[PDB]
Amino acid sequence: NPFQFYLTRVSGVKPKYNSGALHIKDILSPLFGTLVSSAQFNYCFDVDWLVKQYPPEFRKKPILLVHGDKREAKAHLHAQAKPYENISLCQAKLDIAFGTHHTKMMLLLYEEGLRVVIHTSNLIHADWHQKTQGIWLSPLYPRIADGTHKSGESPTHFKADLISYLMAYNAPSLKEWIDVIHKHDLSETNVYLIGSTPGRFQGSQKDNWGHFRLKKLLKDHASSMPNAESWPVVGQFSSVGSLGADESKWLCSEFKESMLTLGKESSSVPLYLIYPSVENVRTSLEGYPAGGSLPYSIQTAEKQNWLHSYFHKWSAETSGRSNAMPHIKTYMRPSPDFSKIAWFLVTSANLSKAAWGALEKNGTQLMIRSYELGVLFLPSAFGLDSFKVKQKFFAGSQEPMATFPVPYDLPPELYGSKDRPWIWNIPYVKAPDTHGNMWVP
Ligand SMILES: *S(=O)(=O)Oc1ccccc1-c1cccc2c(=O)c(C(=O)O)c[nH]c12
């Protein structure tokens, strides 16, 4: 286990399937470090709940909440935090319409060093209760000695890249965290940062964010193999944006083209999209309320029925999580027999142009609406040509440094003819869920 990729704990599965999963209380535990201060980047917050997840002895250490809320939503979040004098707030600018601050990250400053946590869960009870969520834990980064001049940089450029991500906010509270990061040694980091920030990127900046950032990393740090056209692409997400009237508008033109990049040189490639069916949701641990966090609207869906022929059911027997609906998002490049993968990405980014970017101005400008963040696992960053897929997520492989814990089942299973994608704002009243209820929005 050099990967430090974890799932959140799920209430209701056997201990087997929570051994080696992490609750937020585990992440914040004193065993991970003696907390001095922390920043919580997220979308949705329950501040009363969040403070209770810190150890009692750490609950009055400074906390910065980085959010995107405006107007009345912003006022609600300030009211939530008002009782806690140690909580500050940073409103991330969202200067492009319909953008959101979706990045989920913890910056944890300790007496002993610094830790970075990039994950997929909102800071609310339900996101850590019975959902499948993903976590990347950085190593404990030591502080660089005062007077020592060294970069603290990793072979993946993670330190400069994380600072660049923070600089995009142009925010005084985050300049303080940038200076903290400058003072620490991040050289052990073996993942690449893939962020989105709002803007319109041309020229050099084109490769900094979103799907062009992914394409650049795959061009530069992966190698193309023979029969690469046979290696599928897998995207796994919990919501879908408006992608256009057919697959040529965005999904299999620019988005798939970035995903299928390997190496420097120059489509038959199968595209598998994993998104919960109605039946997945109905029979889940949560029942239909799980669909409250799968926000695919009928208005969007009915304009792109072509897309649903790509959809595969959620299935996660390998991690005992078939009934724990996904709020994790992942993208990866498996071999034709799904025994190996060329790379793996865990991210906040759903399958949307807002999250990944859409080309504008005759292909010269990448427009991104939202903040997103993920980390990319490349075999080259581990001295490998590919990763073997771990057969059981929580089991003991024969070579863990070469065996990546994919958290759901392969090959993905196509929707049946009676299945439908979960669409959250129409009623389901033909069969009740695991709690005995229908869904009437
Ligand atoms: S937000 O304003 O709280 O909610 C919105 C707003 C517009 C579209 C979708 C959503 C939404 C609904 C349910 C769950 C969501 C979620 O889990 C995220 C996330 O980034 O984690 C984002 N939006 C969600």
Neighbours of 385 (CB within 10 A): 13
**Dist. CA 369 → ligand 1 center (Å):** 15
CA dist 19 and 48 (Å) reads 27
**Dist. CA 262 → ligand 1 center (Å):** 33
Determination technique for this entry: X-ray
Cβ(198)–Cβ(221) under 8 Å? no
**Ligand 1 site residues, Cβ closer than 6 angstroms:** 43-44, 102, 122, 293, 295, 348
| Nearest alpha carbon to residue 8 among 102, 141, 122 | 122
**How long is the chain?**
441
118 Cβ contact partners less than 8 Å away, ≥ 6 residues apart = 104, 105, 135, 136, 346, 373, 374, 375
Residue to mutate, 100, 102, 119, ligand 1, most ligand atoms under 8 Å from C-beta: 100
CA dist 315 and 317 (Å) reads 6
Determine whether 435 is an active site residue. Answer: no
Find the catalytic residue in 102, 119, 129, 312. 102
Cβ(223)–Cβ(378) under 8 Å? no
Using CA of residue 410, residue 412, residue 416, residue 420, what is the dihedral sign? Answer: positive
Cβ(1)–Cβ(395) under 8 Å? no
| Nearest alpha carbon to residue 227 among 330, 334, 345, 310 | 334
Collect contacts of 152-156 with beta carbons under 8 A, ≥24 apart.
152/182, 152/184, 152/185, 152/186, 152/187, 153/186, 153/187, 154/186, 154/187, 154/188, 154/189, 154/190, 155/190, 155/381, 156/189, 156/190, 156/191, 156/192, 156/193, 156/381
**Dist. CA 295 → ligand 1 center (Å):** 7
Going by alpha carbons, the residue nearest to atom 1 of ligand 1 is 44
Numbered ranges of CATH 3.30.870.10 in the chain: 1-190, 191-441
**Dist. CA 263 → ligand 1 center (Å):** 35
CA dist 203 and 364 (Å) reads 7
Going by alpha carbons, the residue nearest to atom 8 of ligand 1 is 295
* 264 annotated as belonging to a binding site for a ligand: no
Cβ(3)–Cβ(404) under 8 Å? yes
73 CA closest ligand 1 atom index: 2
Phi, psi of 283, rounded to the nearest 5 degrees:
-90, 10
CA dist 317 and 310 (Å) reads 21
Cis peptide before 411 (omega within 30 of 0): yes
Going by alpha carbons, the residue nearest to atom 9 of ligand 1 is 295
Architecture in CATH for domain 191-441: 2-Layer Sandwich (3.30)
Find the catalytic residue in 67, 119, 211, 327. 327
Going by alpha carbons, the residue nearest to atom 13 of ligand 1 is 293
| Pairing mode, strands 134-137 and 35-41 | unpaired
Cβ(223)–Cβ(262) under 8 Å? yes
Architecture in CATH for domain 1-190: 2-Layer Sandwich (3.30)
CA dist 114 and 117 (Å) reads 10
**Dist. CA 205 → ligand 1 center (Å):** 28
102 CA closest ligand 1 atom index: 20
CA dist 105 and 120 (Å) reads 8
Tell me how far the alpha carbon of residue 247 is from its chain's centroid.
Answer: 24
Cβ(348)–Cβ(120) under 8 Å? yes
121 CA closest ligand 1 atom index: 21
Determine whether 221 is an active site residue. Answer: no
Q: Which residue is listed with tokens 């080309």?
A: 359
* 418 annotated as belonging to a binding site for a ligand: no
